[PDB]
């Protein structure tokens, strides 16, 4: 029945996207209640390593032009928190969904709503690596694009794009202003730290394969979780903790978690020219919940 990377519907996030303009630089922002969150990098202009406490002294609210669509918003006061600005605007956003602020942990997925000039352009599925980065697709004007998780009818905002460390590797800040990983909003060299293949996601992806015809890799041998973590230190894999969703997936398919872990180790050294859901490499970008909702819902 097919396995893809899905995205959360964007209807509750789009009405919250605004543009923030200082000087001539324009980036994106998020409008919730009477606050507007956007990167502090909007007040710089002078390249390289800005002096943000020094630049704040000259900035006044009247020089921010925040616009939702074609409507103009007036900034009362502002506040630098970490690496973001929390702008307080006159207007209470009428389309503010029930929301909360969260922090994604490595291996967990979310949806990025890519925006330019305060205008949404598209959305895509991303996974937070052990390097506290994401494999996204961003250009100039994309900072401030938000990453979020849909939770019933509530939106848990988790990500604000800010930085491209290297080709195809990005990161940004949570909505407390703190960067994901040991990075910072400066144009100095910050190549990412070591990354690991997300084991829990690879386990879930193989359960999806089992529920989708492909189960040839399943054998009677089994490798415990704690015996896997000692092997994972030296083969580029992350540590794995027990999981209901994996237990639920295990119960549905009739294959224990320990069989999947043992199948992972054998397949770490070649897929033998065979394919798993049309793939020749592990897929670690689908959480257990992502897989379960595409097997049942």
């Amino acid at each position: 029945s097919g396995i893809v990377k899905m995205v959360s519907p964007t209807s509750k996030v789009e009405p919250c996207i605004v543009s923030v303009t200082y000087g001539n630089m324009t980036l994106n922002g998020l409008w919730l209640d009477d606050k507007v969150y956007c990167p502090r990098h909007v007040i710089c202009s002078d390249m390289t390593d800005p002096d943000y406490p020094n630049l704040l002294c000259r900035v006044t609210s009247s020089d921010f032009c925040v616009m939702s669509g074609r409507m103009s918003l007036t900034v009362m006061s502002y506040q630098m928190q970490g690496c973001q600005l929390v702008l307080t605007v006159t207007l209470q956003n009428p389309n503010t969904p029930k929301y909360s602020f969260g922090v994604v942990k490595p291996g967990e997925t979310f949806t990025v709503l890519a925006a330019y000039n305060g205008r949404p352009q598209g959305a895509f599925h991303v996974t937070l690596r052990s390097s506290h980065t994401i494999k996204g697709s961003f250009l100039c004007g994309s900072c401030g694009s938000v990453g979020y998780v849909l939770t019933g009818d509530s939106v848990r905002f988790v990500y604000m794009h800010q930085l491209e460390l290297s080709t195809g590797c990005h990161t940004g800040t949570d909505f407390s202003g703190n960067f994901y990983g040991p990075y910072r909003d400066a144009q100095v060299v910050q190549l990412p730290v070591q990354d690991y293949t997300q084991t829990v996601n690879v386990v879930a992806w193989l359960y999806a394969a089992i529920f989708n015809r492909c189960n040839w890799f399943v054998q009677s041998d089994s490798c415990s979780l704690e015996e896997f973590n000692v092997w994972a230190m030296t083969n580029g894999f992350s540590s794995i903790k027990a999981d209901l969703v994996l237990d639920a997936l295990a119960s549905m398919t009739g294959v224990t978690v320990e069989q999947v872990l043992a199948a992972i180790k054998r397949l770490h050294s070649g897929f033998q020219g065979k394919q798993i859901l049309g793939s020749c490499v592990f897929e670690d970008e689908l959480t257990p919940s992502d897989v379960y909702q595409q097997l049942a819902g």
């Binding site: 990098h41 994309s142 491209e164 460390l165 940004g172 990075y183 144009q187 100095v188 060299v189």
Partner: peptide
């Protein structure tokens, strides 16, 4: 070297 978006 890292690019600010």
């Amino acid at each position: 070297x890292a690019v600010l978006x």
